[PDB]
């Protein structure tokens, strides 16, 4: 089998900057090297074939180069729509070999999260469960920590966290945190709090509610 090494695995790049991604094959592949872009939930799309040949419908800022074992994809000036994943492909011999991929993420100014907290719905309570949900929307950078507290006491069990991909329109990130309790455990306590620690603030951003206040 022909093996491939692609680098970097990820990178942060500003708008208008020159991006280079490289790929090394374990043997001479005679420039049978193609480059692909893949956006979230979508199929791969060819950018370049036979190492440097370009395609109608692919913007001129994309170019490829190399020969023998060593190849590179260049974006001469990064644009918002270039956010996504990129793969090289050797097709000198089948089985063809994709690189491990490069995640391209865009730099922006730091941004504090917008935090919203949601008590259990009446429907879920009637069914016997109690999920508390906290949204942390539109923050940057990606690194964030969420802590739940009940009656002032941190709770770590029963929490599920999920992060979006980089926002395709403002380059921020969002995350959702769900604390799932039984209805009776929910009813044995009064104050429910989700707090976010982030680079944009020395102190956490705290959203709280009381199980009976309005």
């Amino acid at each position: 089998d022909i093996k491939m090494t692609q680098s970097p695995s990820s990178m942060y790049v500003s708008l208008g900057e020159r991006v280079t991604i490289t790929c090394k094959a374990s043997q001479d592949i005679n420039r049978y090297l193609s480059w692909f872009q893949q956006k979230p939930g979508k199929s791969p799309k060819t950018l370049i074939y036979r190492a440097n040949r370009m395609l109608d419908g692919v913007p001129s800022r994309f170019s490829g180069s190399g020969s023998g074992q060593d190849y590179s994809l260049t974006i001469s000036s990064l644009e918002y729509e270039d956010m996504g994943n990129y793969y090289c492909l050797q097709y000198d011999e089948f089985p063809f070999t994709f690189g491990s991929g490069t995640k391209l993420e865009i730099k922006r100014a730091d941004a504090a999260p917008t935090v919203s907290i949601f008590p259990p719905s009446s429907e879920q309570l009637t069914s016997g469960g109690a999920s508390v949900v906290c949204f942390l929307n539109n923050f940057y950078p990606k690194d964030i920590n969420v802590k739940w507290k009940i009656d002032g006491s941190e709770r770590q069990n029963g929490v599920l966290n999920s992060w979006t991909d980089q926002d395709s329109k403002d380059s921020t990130y969002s995350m959702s945190s769900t604390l799932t309790l039984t209805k009776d455990e929910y009813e044995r306590h009064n104050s429910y709090t989700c707090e976010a620690t982030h680079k944009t603030s020395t102190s956490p951003i705290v959203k709280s509610f009381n199980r009976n206040e309005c």
Binding site: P95, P119, S121, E123, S127, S176
Partner: protein, 221 residues
């Protein structure tokens, strides 16, 4: 229009078999071929095999030669991939792709078929509206939520106002726990929009043929 269209998502048991299809339409005469690709976890891709007279006929990646069988209905240009000896590692998105010869490149790809290999039971989701905390609104903007809890298998689709409310929407990837997925979505609109105007989250879970609408209502005492 020139396109490849694959069959819908699957749930199949360990040790069983599955057959997915890929229909080609609009292509020029005398150019039929098909290649099949697997992508796990939205990350690495690998090639399973192909049917292509210009590349030597029908061939398999050694890794998949035992379990995969590629066939084609040449009349309708429909490709089929049959996989057996299914294991959890076969849970993945499967793509078809067609080589376009001029140089050549993989000019057309199918939209992918999600296959889940699991013995766990299909489970329709509970869908819960998330209204803000009880009380007067504090600010010029308001964020509502929809919670889609305890379903199996993937996928689910979620919209707000049947898709007409699209900006300000953040729908989060599902997270799997104890053979059950949970997904949520937040939407943010100006205070003068809600509750003045109706906002509803629409959830579909194809495995259970579920389609549910939950209107977001202001909380009570």
């Amino acid at each position: 229009e020139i396109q490849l269209q694959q069959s819908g998502p699957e749930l199949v048991k360990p040790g069983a078999s599955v057959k997915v299809s890929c229909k080609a339409s609009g292509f020029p005469f005398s150019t039929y071929n098909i290649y099949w690709v697997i992508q796990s976890h939205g990350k690495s891709l690998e090639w399973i095999g192909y049917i292509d007279p210009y590349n030597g006929g029908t061939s398999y990646n050694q890794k998949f030669r035992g379990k995969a069988t590629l066939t084609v209905d040449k009349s309708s240009s429909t490709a089929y991939m049959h996989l057996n000896s299914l294991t959890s590692e076969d849970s993945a998105v499967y793509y078809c792709a067609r080589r376009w010869y001029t140089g050549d490149w993989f000019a057309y790809w199918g939209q992918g078929t999600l296959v889940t290999v699991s013995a766990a039971k299909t489970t329709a989701p509970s869908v819960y509206p998330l209204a803000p905390v009880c009380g007067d609104t504090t600010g010029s903007s308001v964020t509502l939520g929809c919670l889609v809890k305890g379903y199996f298998p993937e996928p689910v689709t979620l919209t707000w106002n049947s898709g007409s409310l699209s900006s300000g929407v953040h729908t989060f990837p599902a997270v799997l726990q104890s053979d059950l997925y949970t997904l949520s979505s937040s939407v943010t609109v100006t205070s003068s929009t809600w509750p003045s105007q109706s906002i509803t989250c629409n959830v579909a879970h194809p495995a259970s043929s579920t389609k549910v609408d939950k209107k977001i209502e202001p909380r009570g005492p």
